[PDB]
Amino acid sequence: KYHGLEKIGEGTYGVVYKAQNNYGETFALKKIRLSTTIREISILKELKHSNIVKLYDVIHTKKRLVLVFEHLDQDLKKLLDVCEGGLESVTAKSFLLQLLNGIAYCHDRRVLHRDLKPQNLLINREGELKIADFGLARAFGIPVRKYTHEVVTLWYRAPDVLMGSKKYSTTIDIWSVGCIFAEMVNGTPLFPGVSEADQLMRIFRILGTPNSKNWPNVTELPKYDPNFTVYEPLPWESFLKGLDESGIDLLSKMLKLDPNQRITAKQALEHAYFKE
Ligand SMILES: O=C1Nc2ccc(S(=O)(=O)O)cc2/C1=C1/Nc2ccccc2C1=O
């Protein structure tokens, strides 16, 4: 039994509330908006990691369903909102390293998250970051929910996906980490599109329009357009303020447009930018 519920968040498939149990301990309660829930729970049961939110139980009334989770005070979106255009370097490095550890573990366990964004990245007062919201995730090829345009935001979607690739891949999440990385350093989203078409153009405007030299077989993508406006790639220093050479190198390897060229979570953790 839980009480003193207070709305702290809202996604598409449920409302999240802060609540107390009968001993005064705080948890997060996700009321579902009524098999998709069973698939999400199976993922949460499988994944046990410092940087992934823990599920504690599931209460099934006939007219009510609630997932009980550990509670974190904040998410990254709120930290960025209050923040003066971007976090401090040491903090940004710390969140990225934790995000990378969490996602590397996910990928090792055959889980694609597919909806990483500041809102789904939870942070406590100790500066620990935990990945949440596996409602669009995919575990060894079986989706929690069918991946589509309409629900999910566009801002953190990879160019290949936007152009109609149904080629699943861990690559989808690496693209999102890169966008989130950029947003932590600048304080603002790198690619805030309001449609699929505008999202792609925003990506090309900064990183350059793909061609067959830098993205082999790009012409085969369902929504590749021969007549895309051609944009040259921008120098990384011109749209990222105050990121050192190593941080730019790592970032350039996450936001490769061609998914085959993107760095892996595992390789990223080994990059000179962190200790190693
Ligand atoms: O403490 C938490 N535990 C969980 C667990 C699961 C989710 S989920 O995204 O709904 O899956 C969200 C949360 C959660 C959240 N804590 C907060 C605090 C401020 C703003 C938003 C959220 C939030 O979504």
From Swiss-Prot:
What, per the annotation, is the impact of changing T148D? Answer: Phosphomimetic mutant. Increases catalytic activity
* Cited PROSITE patterns: PROTEIN_KINASE_ATP (PS00107), PROTEIN_KINASE_DOM (PS50011), PROTEIN_KINASE_ST (PS00108)
The known PTMs are summarized as: Autophosphorylates in presence of cyclin cyc-1 but not in presence of cyclin cyc-3.
Residues at the active site? D115
Would I find Zinc among this entry's keywords? no
Location(s), subcellular:
Cytoplasm
- Output this protein's name: Cyclin-dependent kinase 2 homolog
Give the species: Plasmodium falciparum (isolate K1 / Thailand)
